Amino acid sequence: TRLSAPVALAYREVSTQP
Amino acid sequence: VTRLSAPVALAYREVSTQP
């Protein structure tokens, strides 16, 4: 019943394969 | 047992309630 707010949000990820 | 992590803001919800 609460939500919070961060300063920044960091997703990821790399070269992936056919 | 170790950390706390103070955020920026904090948001609260609200429900209308009947008597």
Next chain:
Amino acid sequence: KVTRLSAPVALAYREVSTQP
């Protein structure tokens, strides 16, 4: 995705005096 990080404003540890 699997691991979205988030980065807070500040942390806070603590510790008392500990005996020998």
